[PDB]
């Protein structure tokens, strides 16, 4: 996925999960790629641990500098 162009295209139409520098976790689709690792994250939800909390979010573009870990799962989307 990261940087390499061909990996980006293969991973599309999958559900993708992100873990960041502040320990919060995000899950979002992407159909954009910058080889310097900038992607557009859509239809995202975040989970917070105090306890536990969930929040509804707006659409996001992500900078690779903050991402600590990323994993891919889930059923294919539409289109």
């Amino acid at each position: 996925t990261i940087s390499k162009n061909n990996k980006m295209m293969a991973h599309l139409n999958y559900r993708m999960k992100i873990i960041l520098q502040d320990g919060r976790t995000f899950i979002g689709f992407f159909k954009a790629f910058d080889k310097h690792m900038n992607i557009l994250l859509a239809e995202c939800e975040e989970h917070r641990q105090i306890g536990e909390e969930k929040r509804i979010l707006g659409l996001v573009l992500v900078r690779g500098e903050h991402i600590v870990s990323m994993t891919v799962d889930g059923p294919p989307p539409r289109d």
Partner: protein
């Protein structure tokens, strides 16, 4: 010719609407965006800052340097594409 800057093209599309961003100091900003640079330096017109406890403040202008910051969130309108 030019062939570079796909997020910047999206960043240009993100201009004129409202953006959310976080800083290395840990607080969150919400602001309307119309400035972009190749070195990722950016400036926001109209801005609100809110802390993760209960403090919030309003800022009329904020300038952001692209090399000592956490990343910004772009408007939903980009889903037009």
């Amino acid at each position: 010719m030019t062939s570079v800057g796909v997020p910047i093209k999206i960043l240009h599309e993100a201009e004129g609407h409202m953006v959310t961003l976080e800083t290395v100091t840990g607080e969150v900003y919400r602001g309307k965006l119309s400035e972009a640079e190749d070195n990722m330096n950016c400036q926001l017109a109209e801005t609100v800052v809110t802390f993760r406890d209960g403090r919030s403040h309003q800022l009329d202008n904020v300038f952001i340097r692209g090399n000592k910051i956490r990343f910004m969130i772009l408007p939903d309108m980009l889903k037009n594409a």
